[PDB]
């Protein structure tokens, strides 16, 4: 109802206003972002999956998830503090010979509501698309970083996955996970297995 | 010896609207409307 007393939210004639804070839900031989997402990861939004001789497991990237969560939190607080909301109106009454004032008051009251409704819907439908594009960009940066670290040691299958030519154990997987993967110690066996094939 | 890069999914049925597409399923969402 438009008539409010106290500290009250702003009145809009909208039925649904929902804002994205997460990813797109695309469910589903574990493959990368081209096939879809993984249900079995509950540590973070973005991450890795390793399958080797010792075992198979999932892991999450903490830094990218934390930066994304910080930007989405700032987005939420920007939406909340942008529209300061306070006592708006109580309504006025007019007699039978002040019809022009009554129509002017209705014109003002019905002209502000349209502007505020239009502004709220535009804000939601722009910020949702910005959030989704930001998530896709972050996944692309992780893929580029892992590719740039591995170079010629591993082959691309497409589908966001890499197959190691050499033998890569758990410390080898954690080396490319945390950003410190030294090239030369695994280069020779990878050269042999690449040239033999 | 395979490493892959992907993201997180669950069983949520929350839907939002964008400029290209309507009824887009998302993992998490916040309601800004009180009714």
């Amino acid at each position, epitope marked *: 109802h438009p008539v409010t007393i106290g*500290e009250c939210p702003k009145y809009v004639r909208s039925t649904k206003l929902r804002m994205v804070t997460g990813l797109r839900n695309i469910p589903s031989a574990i493959a990368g972002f081209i096939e879809g997402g993984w249900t079995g990861m*509950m540590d973070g939004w973005y991450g890795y999956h390793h399958q080797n001789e010792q075992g198979s497991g999932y892991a999450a990237d903490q830094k990218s998830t934390q930066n994304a969560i910080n930007c989405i939190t700032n987005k939420v*607080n920007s939406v909340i503090e942008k529209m300061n909301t306070q006592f708006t109106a109580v309504g006025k009454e007019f007699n039978k010979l002040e019809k022009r004032m009554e129509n002017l008051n209705k014109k003002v009251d019905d002209g502000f509501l349209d502007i505020w409704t239009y502004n709220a819907e535009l804000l939601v439908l722009l910020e949702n698309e910005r959030t989704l594009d930001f998530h896709d960009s972050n996944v692309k940066n992780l893929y580029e970083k892992v590719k740039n670290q591995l170079r010629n040691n591993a082959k691309e299958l497409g589908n966001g996955c890499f197959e190691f030519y050499h033998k890569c154990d758990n410390e080898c997987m954690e080396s490319v996970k945390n950003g410190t993967y030294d090239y030369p110690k695994y280069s020779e066996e990878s050269k042999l297995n690449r040239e033999k094939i | 010896d395979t490493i892959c890069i992907g993201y997180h999914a669950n069983n949520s049925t929350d839907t939002v609207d964008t400029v290209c597409e309507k009824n887009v399923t998302v993992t998490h969402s916040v309601n800004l409307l009180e009714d």
Partner: antibody, heavy 126, light 112 residues
Framework: QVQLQESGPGLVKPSETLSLTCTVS????????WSWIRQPAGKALEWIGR???????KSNPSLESRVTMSLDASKDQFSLKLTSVTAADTAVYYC?????????????????????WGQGALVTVS | DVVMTQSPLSLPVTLGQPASISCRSS???????????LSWFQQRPGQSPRRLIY???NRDSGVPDRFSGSGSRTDFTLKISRVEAEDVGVYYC?????????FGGGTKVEIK
């Protein structure tokens, strides 16, 4: 009943390493976030850092270089290791536990809740 | 970090009178899950701290009904309707949204 008890040395010399252990009884260690909080005499509380069972320690930016935490499920013990101690580190130390939900993804990326506190141990540096 | 400001430092009240403590934040404390995460703690003299209010309005089990907290955006308030002899001590406000976890300055309650 979840009961937490602290034990450690009262006196440490300067430039040494201070160690405290927070023995937990009544509940498993895997179901909680574990945090350390220090308080100087007649001053404000200060948060040091937190740890969960799989393993990550996020500590306060100021005390990041000199802090190290660990947890053992066999003896149900939570440990602190503070290196290069100074006379400004004289404080009462508390260990706190908060609830962990494995389905909640975002809960790993905010400060943990503080539900069950501990008795506290006094450490002076002289 | 994020700065908490409490008012007043000392609030002497008489038995059977209401009291109010105010906590203010430099930043908004809303999280992306839809919550605020501000807590109110009590410390008796020579004892460990215990919690009174978890989140803006929710009250912990074992806490008396005279403790009520409310607030929004950047200003929050804890109110005690009746003050007894077990209400002495120092009260703090804490935020758990942004890294690192920051505590308030502290408000001391004395009986007149």
């Amino acid at each position: 009943q979840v009961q937490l008890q602290e034990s450690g040395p009262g006196l440490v010399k300067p430039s040494e390493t201070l160690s405290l252990t927070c023995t937990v009884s009544g509940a498993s260690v895997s179901s909680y976030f574990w945090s350390w909080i220090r308080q100087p005499a007649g001053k404000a509380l200060e948060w040091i850092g937190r740890i969960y069972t799989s393993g990550n320690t996020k500590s306060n930016p100021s005390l990041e270089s000199r802090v190290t935490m660990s947890l053992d499920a066999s003896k149900d013990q939570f440990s602190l290791k503070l290196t290069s101690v100074t006379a400004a580190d004289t404080a009462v130390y508390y260990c706190a536990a908060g609830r962990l939900d494995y389905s909640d993804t975002t809960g790993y990326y905010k400060p943990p809740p503080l539900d069950y506190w501990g008795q506290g141990a006094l450490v002076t540096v002289s | 970090d994020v700065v908490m400001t409490q008012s007043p430092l000392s609030l002497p009240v008489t038995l059977g009178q209401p009291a109010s403590i105010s906590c203010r934040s430099s930043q908004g404390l809303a999280f992306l899950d839809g919550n605020t995460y501000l807590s109110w703690f009590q410390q008796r003299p020579g004892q460990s701290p215990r919690r009174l209010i978890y989140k803006v309005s929710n009250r912990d089990s074992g806490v008396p009904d005279r403790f009520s907290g409310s607030g929004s955006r950047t200003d929050f308030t804890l109110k005690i309707s009746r003050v007894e002899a077990e209400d002495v001590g120092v009260y703090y406000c804490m935020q758990g949204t942004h890294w690192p976890l920051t505590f308030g300055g502290g408000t001391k309650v004395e009986i007149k």
